[PDB]
A paper describes a structure:
We thus identified a core region of human SYCP3, corresponding to amino acids 66–230 (SYCP3Core), that is highly stable and can be purified in large quantities to near homogeneity. The crystals contain two tetramers in the asymmetric unit; the tetramers are almost identical both between and within iodide derivative and native structures. The overall architecture of SYCP3 is an extended rod-like structure that spans approximately 20 nm in length. The helical chains of the SYCP3 tetramer are arranged in an alternating anti-parallel fashion, such that each end of the tetramer contains two N-termini and two C-termini. The SYCP3 structure undergoes a left-handed 90° rotation along its length so that the two N-termini at each end of the tetramer lie in orthogonal planes. The two halves of the structure (hereafter referred to as arms) are formed of a four-helix bundle leading into a coiled-coil that zips together the C-terminal parallel chains, leaving the N-terminal ends to splay apart. The most prominent structural feature driving the tetrameric assembly of SYCP3 chains is the presence of two four-helix bundles, one in each arm of the tetramer. The centre of the SYCP3 tetramer is intrinsically asymmetrical as parallel chains B and D interact in a coiled-coil, keeping chains A and C apart by steric exclusion. Instead, the central region likely oscillates between two conformations, in which the coiled-coil encompasses either chains B and D or chains A and C. In both conformations, the left-handed 90° rotation would be retained; interchange between conformations would require a transitory super-helical unwinding of the central region.
Numbering used by the authors:
A (entry chain E): 82 to 224
B (entry chain F): 81 to 224
C (entry chain G): 70 to 221
D (entry chain H): 82 to 221
The structure:
Amino acid sequence: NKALLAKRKRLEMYTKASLKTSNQKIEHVWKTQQDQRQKLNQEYSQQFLTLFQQWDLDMQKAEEQEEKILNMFRQQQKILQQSRIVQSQRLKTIKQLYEQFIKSMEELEKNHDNLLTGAQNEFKKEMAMLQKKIMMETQQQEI
Amino acid sequence: INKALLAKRKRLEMYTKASLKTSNQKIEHVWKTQQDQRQKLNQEYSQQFLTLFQQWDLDMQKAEEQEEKILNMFRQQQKILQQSRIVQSQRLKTIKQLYEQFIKSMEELEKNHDNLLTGAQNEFKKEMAMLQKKIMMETQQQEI
Amino acid sequence: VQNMLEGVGVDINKALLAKRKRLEMYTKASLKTSNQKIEHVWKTQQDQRQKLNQEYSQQFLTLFQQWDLDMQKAEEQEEKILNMFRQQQKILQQSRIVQSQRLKTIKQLYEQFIKSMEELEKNHDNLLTGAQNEFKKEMAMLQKKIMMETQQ
Amino acid sequence: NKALLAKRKRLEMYTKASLKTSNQKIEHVWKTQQDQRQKLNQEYSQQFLTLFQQWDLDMQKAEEQEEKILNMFRQQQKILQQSRIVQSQRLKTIKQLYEQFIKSMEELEKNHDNLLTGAQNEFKKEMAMLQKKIMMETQQ
């Protein structure tokens, strides 16, 4: 009976050990599956993170280049506006110079008119004197 | 005799006066003609220059209007370029957030599943232990 | 008497075989059931992971479809910007050609004006010469008349 | 009659000289006035020539600057275009990576199904051996 109980205890210990091992092997299958699902998620998350980081950097570069264009345009828009302003001033200058030219010609005409009248009056006196000389030197004297 | 001589003299003097008056008037008409032609020429060109200046002023008014349209067009194009960048950044944020939500939902599901699996595994262990205990008790030699 | 104990032994071995067969049948059935229950937990978990994937895939598909449509609209906007610019670029280059012509026109009219004044001066020189010569013929005729008539 | 002809010739010579002198003095007034009109034209022509030259140069620079703005616009139309192309590629890349991810998870599910089946079958063999051992040893 001591032998009987020793045999029973031996079989019970072996059963306990066998169940423990068989269950642990199944537990390792769950852990493997879980490891592989997490590994797959980590691999794709790294790839998505790389894409999102590259996209964010490209948007930062695009913002930087917009700033460069705005500055370039600001400068060129000022030069273009000034070149139009100068042309409008040029038109005003030519119109004013033309009016000045016409006015100078009118002032000169008035001066010339008065000088010509004086010269014409002298010419008339000279011609009258010439005819008076001819008349007096040819005319028959009174008897 | 002297009355006749003086009448002849008076006649010649009147003719001389009339001739000088006419000859001088003809020269005076040359001055007036020259003056007329110079003024006519100035008036003709002034009218032409005025037409050109008026047309030029209107064309400068149109050129300023069109210059404003093309600069506005560039500024409007910049608005489109800037907006498309802003929308892209929003899109990136939306996709990034949806991806993080997906990963988080999978992690939450894993935690729920872990607890459910532990419970099921414990029941399985009890059933296997019960099965082996049944085999042992039904086969074993009884105490004497 | 020994034959009896031996005959008892056969009935013992028959009983032993029957007991073993019964336990083997029960074990087979129990392992099958216990494994099936675990398999169902696995299938449930797998169903819920697939359901989650299907739900997110639908949401990602919506985002990608909306993005594709927005790129089609952006291509439409880009085409209108070009077309409005092409029209405006033509009007602007035409304006600049006209103002170039205006400078040429004014420069030519100015040169024509100066040349006309020079030509008029030359014509006026001939009108004065002609008038002075006519005056010189009239004075000679007048003197001839006075001379001839004062001798009479 | 010799005296009469001498007198006439003297008066004719004087008249010719007087008309010549009087006309020359008027001609000089005319030439002076003409000189002053010609001088005035030359002064203004110099000023107009300067303005026209400067205007021509300013129109050359205005043409070049307009060209720069039109060029700047054309360069941005290319950037807005290359923005649309890069976006479409980016969308394609993300969409493909997402589909790959979903497909990989489906493939993993199928592999995991086989790992569980295999483990369950090994477990069944282990329990059968264990029962056989208990049975054989409880009789001996």
